[PDB]
Design a protein around this ligand. Structure first.
Ligand SMILES: *CC(=O)[C@H](COCc1ccccc1)NC(=O)[C@H](CCCNC(N)=[NH2+])NC(=O)OCc1ccccc1
Ligand SMILES: *CC(=O)[C@H](COCc1ccccc1)NC(=O)[C@H](CCCNC(N)=[NH2+])NC(=O)OCc1ccccc1
Lengths: 253, 253
């Protein structure tokens, strides 16, 4: 395996891999890490022939109990199951008017200062509409993209690397301590601070920095948080659980 | 030639065809009608394989003199000319963080009573930065998408219909009178009001409603104007000059 890897270089033709989204004032990080990785993998496994932003809105609103409780929290693995069973329609970002069900919860400032309003708690989850937005080419059912398999990847650093290498970005989850909230650059190594919660994300490569091994990770807190929306976190040590809850899945293409 | 046609239904796999953008408080309508139609055509010409949002940002800031004066107004055929000579990078809607160069001018209310700020028009043109956004997969030069030809289409209803039918949506322009500002639905036919100015739009279809033949047009004034951002305008009589300034082009393989 390569000593360094970045899915963005590897499948440069696949623009979703480089995209950072914004979950907004809703606790749907479990949904974002999934549809972000599903988008990447649909493109990767069709060698580029299909490039669709899979809709965070559909997953968040229509998954229901197997996924958790919407904007209050949820379970990554229930998202990948849902996709293999009931699939997910396309959907761009907020006010993009791209695809069937663009996300409806507006961008906000995550533990930073900027132009947009500060994020607040967790707005009620939107209702499941099985209807695409006015304008859109095809019907909601027609627009569904399905998965063929979903699986958990075991806590093995080599297996997770191989899985990213072969098949594209994965979803993961780790424990957030307060000192993460103000990450700017470098390799994050928890030192101080209280427990905040569990946070699901997209892992899209690895590397070394000044001899510290890390995972390259896309957060769902917009591009002005962290290092342009991305962060680096110690790899090889089950640091904050980052190697404990990996899940992925292969598209039906 | 059928008695109706919607590029949205013919090329259901090209989601840009159904997408409404917002030009914001910038007179860049000349650029929007262009890059919307070029995005469409890249998808139609590749059969779905290349599915990018062409940047209104790259065209607006970088074209320079032959397009006109950026946010002050411009010339559609210059746009299509610059596309074939220099090409144009990908670039999503505001805050979409998708593609090389997303749009940097925020959305606003175009003569409607909604929640976003009113457009104050004005707009100073941004500078041309030969550089993608931080996070993007490829370089600015490497991201360029090139036109093979650009051409005008003559004032002939049938030719214009045949051009849309074969090759996809086109850019047009027409004289805007103040009674257009409050269109909601049905086929537009000017009746009263003063002249406001020239307006460049994307034409993507045609049909007949209640005996009246129309063009189906995408405006760049967001989805809350008109009929979900679209509008129909009397066809077959050069109405408001709608059949006089049709410009299009073919993308390079
Ligand atoms: C990440 C996200 O949006 C929500 C809430 O975020 C809390 C938070 C996270 C980071 C920093 C500050 C605050 N979190 C969840 O959806 C988590 C993600 C996955 C956690 N992993 C496991 N194994 N549960 N899921 C979660 O909290 O499930 C519990 C729950 C479900 C339903 C309702 C309440 C709680
Ligand atoms: C449409 C666009 O945003 C601007 C401003 O339009 C003003 C307006 C339109 C409708 C309703 C209210 C206000 N217009 C243009 O960019 C036009 C489009 C081209 C159509 N006709 C032309 N003339 N061939 N271009 C334009 O106005 O060129 C003139 C100009 C160029 C440079 C500087 C000033 C004016």
């Amino acid at each position: 395996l390569p000593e360094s890897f970045d899915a963005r270089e590897q499948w440069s033709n696949c623009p979703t891999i480089a995209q950072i989204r914004d979950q907004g004032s809703c606790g749907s990080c479990w949904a974002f890490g999934a549809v972000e990785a599903m988008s990447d993998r649909i493109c990767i496994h069709t060698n580029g022939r299909v490039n669709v932003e899979v809709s965070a809105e559909d997953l968040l609103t229509c998954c229901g109990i197997q996924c958790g409780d919407g904007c209050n929290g949820g379970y990554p693995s229930g998202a990948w199951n849902f996709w293999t069973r009931k699939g997910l329609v396309s959907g761009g970002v907020y006010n993009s008017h791209i695809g069937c069900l663009p996300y409806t919860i507006p961008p906000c400032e995550h533990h930073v200062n900027g132009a947009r309003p500060p994020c607040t708690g967790e707005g009620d989850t939107p209702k499941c509409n099985k209807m695409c937005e006015a304008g859109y080419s095809t019907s909601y059912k027609e627009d569904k993209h399905y998965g063929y398999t979903s699986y958990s990847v075991s806590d093995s650093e080599k297996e997770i690397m191989a899985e990213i290498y072969k098949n594209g970005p994965v979803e993961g989850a780790f424990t957030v301590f307060s000192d993460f909230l103000t990450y700017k650059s470098g390799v994050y190594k928890h030192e101080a601070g209280d427990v905040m919660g569990g946070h699901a994300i997209r892992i899209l490569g690895w590397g070394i920095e000044n001899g510290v091994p890390y995972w390259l990770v896309a957060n769902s807190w917009n591009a002005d948080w962290g290092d342009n929306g991305f962060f680096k976190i110690l790899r090889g040590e089950n640091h904050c659980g980052i190697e404990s809850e990996i899940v992925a899945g292969i598209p039906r293409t």
